[PDB]
Structures are given as structure tokens and as C-alpha cells.
């Protein structure tokens, strides 16, 4: 895994984020790859490396490819590369905008599949959203960014009191208590449904954090986005149920939006 920095040549960089930088580049010479560096003090070099080590244990085509490591600051992740990056991104741009839904419905399907994986595994996300996914230049669609992804072995993780977590995507139970399941991914699923027929438009627009939370506790969910086809808003009411234990699977999720683009 772990490979000589000079292998490497960096060319373009793509995002920069608080812990570190995105970059386009080539791997002994032929091979497009992307990779993330680390800002030398956002976090040991372990716990950005940690990422890495699970990538190890996740690989599916359905899921971002760990290449190497560079274990000498500045450390490196080198990984897969996906032309078109960020799905929130790709959404708003010429090509994403033309999308049909049928495409779009494609795309939630393959993430559903992507997840599943996961879900099989015994591994929770905890950071699934629209900005996470990427795209490549054939437009399918991978998951990335695991570093706050946990083995679950007692069916549950329980945060860190005092970790602070995008509140829009993340489910109640998570929320008010800290604990995580898959479940709990898949109520961060149903958003990213919402982010997928908006084109990559936030979740709740025009409302507070702290508005939606009371409006979740009033039972409240989230209001039908503009063009979104009833029955993709009905499945993404399951994945938004008020108990963890009564949202579906990535499995099922997947076959019903796989039938859904199908019917199109
Ligand atoms: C050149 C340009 C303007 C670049 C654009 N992408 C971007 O701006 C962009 C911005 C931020 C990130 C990325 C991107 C692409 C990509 N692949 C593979 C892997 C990663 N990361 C990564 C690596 C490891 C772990 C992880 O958890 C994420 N990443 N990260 C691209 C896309 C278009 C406009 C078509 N093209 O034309
Ligand atoms: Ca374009």
C-alpha cells in the first residue's frame, strides 16, 4: 500500500477543505488518480490515515478504490479517480442539469447499492450525503470519504458527546442521543434522495438547524421538493420513519429505485 511520494506527480487541485487538500494527478506516469493530502496539525497522522486502513477492508466497485499511501508529512491517500467529482457539484453543471430523472433514479440506485455493501459489512457511514458521492466520467457513482465510518458490532455506535454532525442529514435518534445504526444512515439516504431531484439544493431551504429539529419532534418531515415524483417522496418518507428499527434496507432500497428507473 505504501508507495514512494516521487511515484507521484500533482497537477490539478480540487478541493481544500479543513484538513486538507484534493488534488488531480498521475501515478507512475499513466495512471489518473486522485489525491488527498493532510494539513500537518488538522489531525494526527494516524486518524487521517485511518481512513485508508478501511478502505482496505471496503472495496466494491460501487465504492471509491484506495490505491496507496504516503506515510512521510505531507501524508497522502492516493485513490481512484472520478472525473466528474462531487455529485452536489456535477448536479448544478450543464451536463447534471440536462439529467433526466430516469438517470437521477439510476444514481440513487447505485448508491442504495453502494450502501448495501456497506450495510452487509457491518458498517455504518455516518457521513452519507450528496457532496460525498462521486462521479465518474460515465457517470456512474461511488461513495467516498470514510472517515467517519465505524465497524458496528452491537448493532449500534454511540458518538462521542461533543461531536457536532451536519443536523439536516442526520437522522433523530443520532441527533438528540448520539447513537448511530444503519438505520440511521439510511434517514441520511433520504436526503440525499431529496438532494438528488433538487439538483443539489440544501435540505429544509430557507429553514434553521434548530427549526428542523423542532419540526421533526412535532412529526413533522421534510416538504415535498419542487418536480419530485410522489412516489420517490413516499420512499423517501420510509427511510424517514420515527422509529430506526421500521426503515428498510439498502437491499430493498435499492430494488424499488432500480424499479423505478425502470418504469421510465
Ligand atoms: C477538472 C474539473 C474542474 C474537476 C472537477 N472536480 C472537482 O472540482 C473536485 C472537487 C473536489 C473533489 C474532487 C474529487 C474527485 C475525486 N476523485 C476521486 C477521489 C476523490 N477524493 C477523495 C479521495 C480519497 C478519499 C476521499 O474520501 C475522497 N476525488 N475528489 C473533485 C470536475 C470537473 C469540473 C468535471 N472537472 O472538469
Ligand atoms: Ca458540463
Known sequence: WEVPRETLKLVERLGAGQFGEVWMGYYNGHTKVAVKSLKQGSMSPDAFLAEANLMKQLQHQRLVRLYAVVTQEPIYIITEYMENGSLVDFLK?????????????????????????????????????????????????????????????????????????????????????????????????????????????????GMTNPEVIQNLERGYRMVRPDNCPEELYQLMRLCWKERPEDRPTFDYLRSVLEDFFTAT
Open 93 to 205: 453543471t450543464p451536463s447534471g442539469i440536462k439529467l433526466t430523472i430516469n438517470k437521477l433514479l439510476d444514481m440513487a440506485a447505485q448508491i442504495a447499492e453502494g450502501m448495501a455493501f456497506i450495510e452487509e459489512r457491518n458498517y455504518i457511514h455516518r457521513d452519507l450525503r450528496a457532496a460525498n458521492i462521486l462521479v465518474s466520467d460515465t457517470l456512474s457513482c461511488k461513495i467516498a470519504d470514510f472517515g467517519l465510518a465505524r465497524l458496528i458490532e452491537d448493532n449500534e455506535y454511540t458518538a462521542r458527546e461533543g461531536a457536532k454532525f451536519p443536523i439536516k442529514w442526520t437522522a433523530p435518534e443520532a441527533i438528540n442521543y448520539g447513537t448511530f445504526t444503519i438505520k440511521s444512515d439510511v434517514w441520511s439516504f433520504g436526503i440525499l434522495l431529496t438532494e438528488i431531484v433538487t439538483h443539489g439544493r440544501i435540505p429544509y431551504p
